[PDB]
Amino acid sequence: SVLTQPPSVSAAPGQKVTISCSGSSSNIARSYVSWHHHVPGTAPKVLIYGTNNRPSGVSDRFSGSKSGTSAFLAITGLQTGDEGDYYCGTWDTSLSAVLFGGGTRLTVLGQPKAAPSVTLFPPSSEELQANKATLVCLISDFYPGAVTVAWKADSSPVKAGVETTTPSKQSNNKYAASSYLSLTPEQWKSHRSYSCQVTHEGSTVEKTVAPT
Amino acid sequence: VQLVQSGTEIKQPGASVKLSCKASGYTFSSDYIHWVRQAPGQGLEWIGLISPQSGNKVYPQSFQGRVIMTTDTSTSTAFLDLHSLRSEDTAVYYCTRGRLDVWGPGVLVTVSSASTKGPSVFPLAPSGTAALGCLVKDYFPEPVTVSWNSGALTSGVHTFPAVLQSSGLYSLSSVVTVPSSSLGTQTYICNVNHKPSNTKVDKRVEPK
């Protein structure tokens, strides 16, 4: 009634990975299996259909098979392009429905870590003339792709006014995020400074702006 | 061998939406058309299938009652009508051929209480490389496109994905890294296009 998949797999470049998909006697055991590769931002790519057929254009280092209630996708010659989520799908006869697994995230090991670049813009003159103030904190070229963002007004943390982006993958395979702090012009002008602190892999970069 | 889909949709909770799928060419009768969606950050979810030949359909228990799939006289031209929309139904909807071997390009359905609003664009002024950008503030819906100097400036350019605010409106920033000396020798203008609101803005970014 559900299809399960391991949450993630990983290997170094050039190795083989195998991704597992588990069902029951009413679906995988008796129905064609399909596999799909999805990179958030792009439509999913069909890699396997009819349990072992590759669509025209799909690289031959991908292959499908099946044993009992389990189905398997093998990827040889692993490259950075192979990273992303993999979903298996199949028809369940007891449900009369197509089931999809929860997906397996593939990571290629060995990629160099990179501390984030932080740019902090103060409110523009035009925005302030219009009685608004936004502080913009841009965070780019970090790997792995997870950061935490904190804001300070002088030395104290700012609980109210922050909105922060989840990390997003760049053309160079590093990651980017954004944080915004919304203030009144009066709030901006009263304090000595404002700061954006970005934490990555347990270390911290802080950038600071001031009304003057 | 391909599938073309209707375009993006913005709906209130409670609303309904009708999406269309068409084969690009001609087919010998038909097998089946599936609909599959994917909500942001989540996995794939099957909505049902229909034979464009016979009009027979099946839906999973999870969607029965809220969905109608229809076909017309064509051998390849299916429709999905999704009712009683809620925030949870924001997703990209896909159609596929019968073996899930070929997929349409997706259409975004956003369920939101917000109304269309064009962006307010503000300069992010630079003070041997300098960062300079524009803040594209408080617009609905997505997308915005941003280019710099009408397409002549591409290198150094990084448009960030938008934040969705608690008000329901989006904001994004675009920034360009340039040599500091060119700050005195070259004008920088960001070209912001928000088609949903039929609005375009060219915003000159002057040094501080």
Binding site: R30, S31, Y32, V33, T93 | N56
Partner: peptide
């Protein structure tokens, strides 16, 4: 119909 379900069971069958 059950007949349509039987159709689909056959279309997707892979022993």
């Amino acid at each position: 119909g059950i007949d349509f379900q039987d159709e689909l069971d056959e279309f997707f069958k892979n022993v």
